[PDB]
Ligand code: HEM
């Protein structure tokens with residue numbers, strides 16, 4: 001189950017975060033593992049498309065090759081805190097699994113600047129158990145976590161040493177698909 005009410009960044013700059021560009025997950029902390037794989041790849045694009053707040057997601061398991069994309073129109077709970085009802089799509093935006101009640105994630109931006117971010121997410125997917133997942137993001141897929149985002153991890157009363165890196169997985173991303181999925 002999810003247990004955290006994550007606090008959004010004071011003074012969160014939504015237009016900068018939701019600028020249409022890509023964010024890569026560099027490190028993550030799942031509070032209820034044996035539930036996500038140790039080795040994983042994920043990225044997202046976040047932007048406004050025709051007036052609608054959107055996120056496109058990519059997941060890739062580098063060992064199994066399991067791959068999937070999603071798109072959601074985000075609803076606002078408060079500044080920096082969103083609810084996202086997702087649809088599974090192919091890379092071109094064709095629907096594989098339609099939006100449904102009970103398929104949603106929450107999304108809280110705890111820290112962001114132009115190059116880095118710390119987010120919390122709680123995924124609800126049908127009758128699957130939910131659990132808290134924190135992710136350190138960067139605009140540069142290869143960037144080591146810097147002092148701004150590591151300090152934010154500490155300020156959330158988390159230990160960065162517990163986060164698992166994605167950097168050793170040979171992750172290659174289709175940035176073009178993520179950007180184009182924002183419109184879909
Ligand atoms: C921005 C961060 C992330 C968000 C918003 C997010 C969101 C989601 C969503 C919406 C799904 C369901 C997709 C679908 O069924 O259509 C999903 C599935 C999954 N995610 Fe993430 N995810 C994120 C990062 C990660 C990371 C870093 C991992 C690490 C392993 C991960 C592991 C998984 C796994 C294993 C599933 C499949 C769940 C299942 O059906 O059993 N995710 N995620």
Ligand SMILES: [N+]
Pocket residue numbers: 123133
């Ligand atoms: N997830």
